[PDB]
From a paper:
To understand the structural basis for [name]-[name]-2 viral-host protein recognition, here we use cryo-electron microscopy (cryo-EM) to determine a complex structure of the human [name] and [name]-[name]-2 viral envelope (E) protein. [name]-[name]-2 and [name]-[name]-1 genomes encode a small envelope (E) protein that is a critically important component in assembly, release, and virulence phases of the viral life cycle. PDZ-domain-containing proteins in cell junctions have been hijacked by various viruses to potentiate their virulence. Both [name]-[name]-2 and [name]-[name]-1 E proteins harbor a PDZ-binding motif (PBM) at their C-termini. [name] is an integral part of an apical cell polarity complex, consisting of Crumbs, [name], and PATJ9.
To study the structural basis for recognition of [name] PSG by the [name]-[name]-2 E C-terminal domain, we synthesized an E C-terminal 18-amino acid peptide (Ec18) containing the PBM. The solved structure contains a dimer of PSG and a single Ec18. In one PSG monomer, the PDZ, SH3, and GK domains were observed; while in the other monomer, the PDZ domain was missing. In our structure, Ec18 is inserted in a hydrophobic pocket between the PDZ and SH3 domains through the PBM (72DLLV75). Residues Phe318, Leu321, Leu267, Pro266, and Val284 from PDZ, and Leu369 and Leu403 from SH3 are involved in forming the hydrophobic-binding pocket. Among these residues, Phe318 is sandwiched by two hydrophobic residues Leu73 and Val75 in Ec18, representing another notable recognition feature. Nevertheless, we found conformational changes for two SH3 loops associated with Ec18 binding. One loop containing residue Leu403 moved as much as 4.5 Å; and the other loop containing Leu369 also moved so that Leu369 has a closer engagement with Leu74 from Ec18. Crb-CT interaction involves three domains (PDZ, SH3, and GK) of PSG, while Ec18 appears to interact with the PDZ and SH3 domains only. Consequently, in the PSG–Ec18 complex, the PDZ and SH3 domains are rotated ~38° relative to the GK domain, likely due to the disengagement of PDZ and SH3 domains from the GK domain. In our structure, we observed densities for 9 out of 18 residues from the Ec18 peptide.
Author numbering:
A (entry chain A): 248 to 336, 345 to 410, 461 to 609, 620 to 675
B (entry chain C): 67 to 75
C (entry chain B): 346 to 410, 461 to 609, 620 to 675
Write the structure that this text describes.
């Protein structure tokens, strides 16, 4: 009964007419907790988490409904709560704005009661930068009686002029190549074709792993087996472009290994999530970022709800990404591949533009 | 216009 | 010497009333590249474009809105007890700078002081080279511009003047807060060095009251020039009124700096 899955029963105390600082979405036949808003009883108890779901609230089933009756139920009950759930699978940094913003005109915000309008020249407490596209914040001089938090756009520092310079690729120390884009628009096939049709002109970066040494991969041919203590020490030092736990072990990618590959006359290839760029630019690798994007819905459905969400996610990675230096519109595959080879061969006989910092 | 965006409980 | 820059803000000169020709615009989109040829003008640089406009000589004018951010990192700061911050006044050339400066350091016997300038004029006996002036020959004086150790250096009758950056520090190491009177072209250096200043802005009043004070042309000129909202470096600004009334705010601020802490950009602290 009640799904018969890994079930937990939790208790949270709620008064009358008091929001509980949780954001509930509505996707396929189930209700999903989406955010935890600080300063609310949910954060105080520190029990609920994002990604979970709901079965029944105070003994009344939930699955099979929309959000509005859930809202009506929660806005009419007080006292001790009873929730049924299955589990999931910082420090203040005062800032000062330099523009204007007003949520009621922005058709993009992931809620409408957490806007937090503010004029130019204010001061903000920022509490969490966890979701790197929407920060949680408090306006200075109003801290206590908000009472909850607010959301503010996560524009990274972007100037209104810079200083660029010409740069010529040397004879035999070639710049990396770094592909980014949405999750399901054929990056992997492109990588495999590039590494298979041409075999002696590309390479890769061997990662770090804290697993056990199986009897198929020896010393430095496929991994860099180490002890976990060194791994957390390196994370603290900040030597990792990207790192993520998986299966009780740790993976990643270093910065020395990329130098080993780039230091012998080959073109490194990679693939990244949109998070890591901030760490990559500040170093001196001198990357070259390429954005692979899908075309409109009609031709894509020709190629192969899910279409709409993929177009939407494509939209998000632009309008707050301005680093990269070229966009490839995916099409007939063996035309995008030709375009990619054209671009990469172009670098050898045509100088390029880099911010002048990377040379001083 | 993804969905009705969200809701605060 | 040319400088290459890369824009980041869309701008179309179809209507912006501060361009003093109404048709020399060099409209461009976000992500273009400029070829700046002449920057000595405090505003309205002279610019090419990179692209189709290259064939013809451009020689256009582009707004000089120097680098400003979107988000910045700040920090709290308490004033020390023996190394106080300096005070610098900026404003349009006719509103009451000199009056406030002289009366502010004249009615407090030993609480304020001023730095000393470098001068290439003739050495004399009345002006002792230690108490007021810093007599130095011409060639070495001309040398230091290459290093860039000057706040602001003007020219007057074949003699060039300016102030050090070490005289200010020397006065800071004592008591007796030091005052100045700056020019808006020369902020970058004094905001980028480890000096930690405090900038306040003096503004002129509206047409009616100013006309009452001491025809329409000069009033229009002053209210136009007051629209130098190409700064916004400075912390706080006041508005002029009855002259023997501005003290209730000026002294309040300059003396209140002792008690409550202030905000400074996180760079200066570390």
């Amino acid at each position: 009964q009640y799904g018969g899955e890994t079930v937990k029963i939790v208790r949270i105390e709620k008064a009358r007419d008091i929001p509980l600082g949780a954001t509930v979405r509505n996707e396929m036949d189930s209700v999903i907790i989406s955010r935890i808003v600080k300063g609310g009883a949910a954060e105080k108890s520190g029990l609920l988490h994002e990604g979970d779901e709901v079965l029944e609230i105070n003994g009344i089933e939930i699955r099979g409904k929309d959000v509005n009756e859930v809202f009506d139920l929660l806005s009419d009950m007080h006292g001790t709560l009873t929730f049924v759930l299955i589990p999931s699978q910082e420090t203040v940094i005062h800032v000062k704005a330099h523009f204007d913003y007003d949520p009621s005109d922005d058709p993009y915000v992931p809620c409408r009661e957490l806007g937090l309008s503010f004029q130019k020249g204010d001061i903000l407490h920022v509490i969490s930068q966890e979701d790197p596209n929407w920060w949680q914040a408090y306006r200075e001089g109003d801290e206590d009686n908000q009472p909850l938090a607010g959301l503010v756009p996560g524009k990274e520092e972007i100037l209104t002029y810079e200083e660029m310079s010409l740069y010529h690729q040397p004879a035999n120390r070639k710049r990396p190549i770094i592909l980014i884009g949405p999750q399901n628009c054929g990056q992997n096939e492109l990588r495999q074709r590039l590494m298979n049709k041409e075999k002696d002109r590309f390479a890769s970066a061997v990662p770090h792993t804290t697993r056990s040494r199986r009897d198929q991969e020896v010393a430095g041919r496929d991994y860099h087996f180490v002890s976990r203590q060194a791994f957390e020490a390196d994370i603290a030092a900040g030597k990792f472009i990207e790192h993520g736990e998986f299966e009780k072990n740790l993976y990643g990618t270093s910065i020395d290994s990329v130098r080993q590959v780039i230091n012998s006359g080959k073109i490194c290839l990679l693939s990244l999530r949109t998070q890591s760029l901030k760490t990559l630019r500040n170093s001196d690798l001198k990357p070259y970022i390429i954005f692979i994007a899908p075309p409109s819905q009609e031709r894509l459905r020709a190629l192969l709800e899910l279409r709409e969400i993929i177009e939407k996610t494509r939209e998000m990675e632009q309008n707050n990404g301005h680093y990269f230096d070229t966009a490839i519109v995916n099409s007939d595959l063996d035309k995008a591949y030709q375009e990619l080879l054209r671009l990469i061969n172009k670098l050898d006989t045509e100088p390029q533009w880099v911010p002048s910092t990377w040379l001083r | 216009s993804s969905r009705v965006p969200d809701l605060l409980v």
